[PDB]
């Protein structure tokens, strides 16, 4: 099975680059410089957020603009969850309880991807905007930034790159164990395979790096609690703002999570 | 060092034995019939139960309140018997004492629940070192918040069985989770990630000797670890609501003393 193993993670691993247009690998290239074709303008205070407009309330704003890119983000898992084999032949009801279960946990996790421990990379990575300058937004949106970076800087610790990150987020999807699902073998038989393949994955190219299965599967335990913060931070800003909205796919997502 | 893993996993087995009253061999061989428990099924077969079964902990008049109380005290023993399970985990003793006391505080939960799981089916739970067997009907039926306190704790233990663990699986286990890392106020988490590693090496090893035919069964039993912390952090959301709608909670403060950590 070795061999369709190494099988299943280049084909999840193709399938990765192509739903996901900024890679772990795109995303360093332009954090850690060197290139000056790849440099981003830096976003840090009001004045320069303004000055970013010209080139690529002000706490809402950006919260729109996290929202407008979580719902692209959605789109793209969505479009990769379909390539993982055996997920568009399970029951409708089934996968989309998967995805809306899972998505979350996904984009926290890719998200760390575009994170160093000063900030995060913005629009396709044309932007760079510092976590300081998220930290210090007003009322509880300054609160909404911080706890991603706090998990990122401990995630990218891992040193995982895309080929294992292809894998990790297919065995997320594919959990037995979100509410609500009505077949739940047919799940965890894809999920085995999915995780026969990441322990292979993580041994062939990390072999110095011990047990760096089992330090993986314990990241799953960081994101579920993010999640959860989030949702409940949310809670609070829809009835602070009531005049405003969320898209119709994040307000599905929500409901009764 | 495959002979290392295996003297690992036996030395936590040999000492979960001593360091637990009530194995889960011996409390299944109870649950499934296979010497008969009381039953407390409601209101009149727990007044008889104290009566003759003889709880540690009778002195509120009430009866939920007392058998939340009676869950208390039953915790507070079990913290000192984790404790003790602990010390004779390789390389425990010798880290920095504040981050002994750090691990246990942090950790006693996770263990708490994973070892109830021991003594627990879907229809109830065993008591005083199985002497004593209290229905799941008859503790959801508990009035106000103390019915919705016990089925969650059932709830998780039904899934976590599932995965038919057996002592020296769970030996092994319970010392990866007191070996945690990521336990705010850590002063050296270097010496403890690297007795996790251990750890996690002898019990990936002991679950493909044991369950050779449970493919990805190491895989399974890490993602209960979520389980866990999750059903963690909705006990502390539940004890605060009780601890502010319950005037009736009247303990001796030498009692509220002891019983302050959980
Ligand atoms: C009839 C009579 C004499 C009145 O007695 C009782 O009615 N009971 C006493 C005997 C029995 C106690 O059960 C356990 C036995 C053991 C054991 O043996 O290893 C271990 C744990 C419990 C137990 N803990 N626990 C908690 O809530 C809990 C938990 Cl998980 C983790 C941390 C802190 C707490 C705290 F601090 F908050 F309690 C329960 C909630 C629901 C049920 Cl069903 C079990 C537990 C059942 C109650």
Not at 65 to 72: H, I, K, N
């Amino acid at each position: 099975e070795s061999a369709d193993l190494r099988a299943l993670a280049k084909h999840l691993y193709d399938s990765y680059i192509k739903s996901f247009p900024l890679t772990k690998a795109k995303a360093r290239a332009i954090l850690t410089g060197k290139t000056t074709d790849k440099s981003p303008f830096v976003i840090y205070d009001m004045n320069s957020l303004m000055m970013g407009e010209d080139k690529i309330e002000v706490a809402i704003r950006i919260f729109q603009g996290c929202q407008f890119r979580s719902v692209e983000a959605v789109q793209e898992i969505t479009e990769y969850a379909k390539s993982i084999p055996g997920f568009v032949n399970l029951d409708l009801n089934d996968q989309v309880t998967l995805l809306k279960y899972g998505v979350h946990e996904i984009i926290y996790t890719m998200l760390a991807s575009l994170m160093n421990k000063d900030g995060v990379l913005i629009s396709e990575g044309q932007g760079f905007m510092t976590r300081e300058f998220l930290k210090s937004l007003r009322k509880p949106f300054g609160d909404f930034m911080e706890p991603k970076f706090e998990f990122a800087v401990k995630f990218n610790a891992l040193e995982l790159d895309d080929s294992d990150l292809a894998i990790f987020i297919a065995v997320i999807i594919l959990s037995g164990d979100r509410p609500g699902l009505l077949n739940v073998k047919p799940i965890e038989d894809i999920q085995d395979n999915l995780l026969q393949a990441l322990e292979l994955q993580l041994k062939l190219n990390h072999p110095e790096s011990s047990q760096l299965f089992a330090k993986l599967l314990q990241k799953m335990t960081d994101l579920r609690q993010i999640v959860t913060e989030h949702v409940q931070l949310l809670q609070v800003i829809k009835k602070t703002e009531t005049d405003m909205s969320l898209h119709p796919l994040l307000q599905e997502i929500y409901k009764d999570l």
